[PDB]
């Protein structure tokens, strides 16, 4: 069997003429020839058997992409393992390849408005129907949105998703552990555990001042770092605001803040639509409550070039609601089955 700049990708006959693209903690992802579809793809080798957090990201990560279908959420084509459990070592999910991610990209390409508002529409229109599925993606940062030569962008990476339930999404102070710490919602630090929609969307109001400056918006050194950066643009949170966080040990904290003002995006984005801007503001309020939902941020006149519910399609069979990783080996095997 065939390995690559490290180990074997058991990948069978049908893929061949592999080429090593990246790597992971426990896996590697190559490109490689599809000898059935006559086209080259992407195989992700996944080795996560020996560690229960591990078998859990992988099993959402299948679970979910399975059962998704959308122009804007990258699709599993075949996955590939032993015949049995006890042989089962390794899965390899087989994707469509795609040239780069936006995370690779802004590390050296300026983008055109077009291509932010492009960018942006096609982030919204996967996430609108990932929210229609009542799933929250939870990680949603540029590594995460993969883009073709024709800059088609994909959604990946479901490891850190959840079913959303608003009605246990309260917690206390300085307790939480949400998405990537530079796209991660004030209130994750204040007292949400980021079971809803809203914190999705504070991720894309951070890429997307991301793509209009190529850096974060919001770069905390350290976990505890990340509230200083947003309020040092955001500024002090108004009463009504606070008046929201009824924990005692989270109001009090901001309460004992000096008070900071506002800074403009239009200073800090002098050279950004102010259409852009606007939408921004609305994606980035502190208030989770008042901010914008996925479906009013495809309306914003920002996208009115691409802006057509009809054509902005939401999930047929959303998702509607521990385990020993010998349980979830078993149920990874019983979920790849249909590719066997
Ligand atoms: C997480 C993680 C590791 N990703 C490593 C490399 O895989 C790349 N990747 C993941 N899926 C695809 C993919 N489907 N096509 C091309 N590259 C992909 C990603 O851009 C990165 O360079």
Redesign the pocket.
């Known amino acids: 069997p065939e390995m690559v700049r490290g180990q074997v990708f058991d990948v069978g006959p049908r893929y061949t003429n592999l080429s090593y693209?990246?790597?992971?903690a426990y896996?590697?992802?190559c490109?490689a020839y599809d000898n059935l579809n006559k086209v080259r793809?992407?195989i992700?080798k996944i080795s996560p058997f020996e560690h229960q957090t591990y078998c859990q990201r992988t099993l959402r990560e299948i679970k979910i992409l399975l059962r998704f279908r959308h122009e804007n959420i990258?699709g599993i084509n075949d996955i590939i393992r032993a015949p049995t459990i006890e042989q089962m070592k390794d899965v390899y999910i087989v994707?469509?390849?795609?040239?780069?991610?936006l995370?690779?990209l802004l590390k050296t390409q300026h983008l055109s408005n077009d291509h932010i508002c492009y960018f942006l529409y096609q982030i919204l229109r996967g996430l609108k129907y990932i929210h229609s599925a009542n799933v929250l993606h939870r990680d949603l940062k540029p590594?995460?949105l993969?883009l073709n030569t024709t800059c088609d962008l994909?959604i990946?990476?479901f490891g850190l998703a959840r079913v959303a339930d608003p009605d246990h999404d309260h917690t206390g102070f300085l307790t939480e552990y949400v998405a990537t710490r530079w796209y991660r919602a004030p209130e994750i630090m204040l007292n949400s555990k980021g079971y809803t929609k809203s914190i999705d969307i504070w991720s894309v109001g951070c890429i997307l001042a991301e793509m209009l400056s190529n850096r974060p918006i919001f770069p905390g050194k350290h976990y505890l770092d990340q509230l200083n950066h947003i309020l040092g643009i955001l500024g002090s949170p108004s009463q009504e605001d606070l008046n929201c966080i009824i924990n005692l040990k989270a109001r009090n904290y901001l309460l004992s803040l000096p008070h900071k003002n506002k800074v403009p995006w239009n200073r800090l984005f002098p050279n950004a639509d102010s259409k852009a801007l606007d939408l921004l503001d609305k994606m980035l309020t502190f208030n989770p409550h008042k901010r914008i939902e996925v479906e009013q941020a495809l309306a914003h006149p920002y996208l009115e070039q691409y802006y057509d519910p009809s054509d902005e399609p939401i999930a047929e069979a959303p998702f509607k609601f521990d385990l020993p990783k010998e349980k979830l080996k078993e149920l990874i095997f019983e979920e790849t089955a249909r590719f066997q």
Do not use: F, P, R
């Not at 693209?21 to 992971?24: K, Q, R, V």
């Not at 994707?95 to 991610?101: F, I, K, R, S, V």
């Open positions: 693209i990246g790597e992971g896996g590697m992802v490109s793809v992407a992700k990258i994707q469509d390849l795609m040239e780069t991610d995370y690779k590594s995460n993969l994909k990946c990476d």
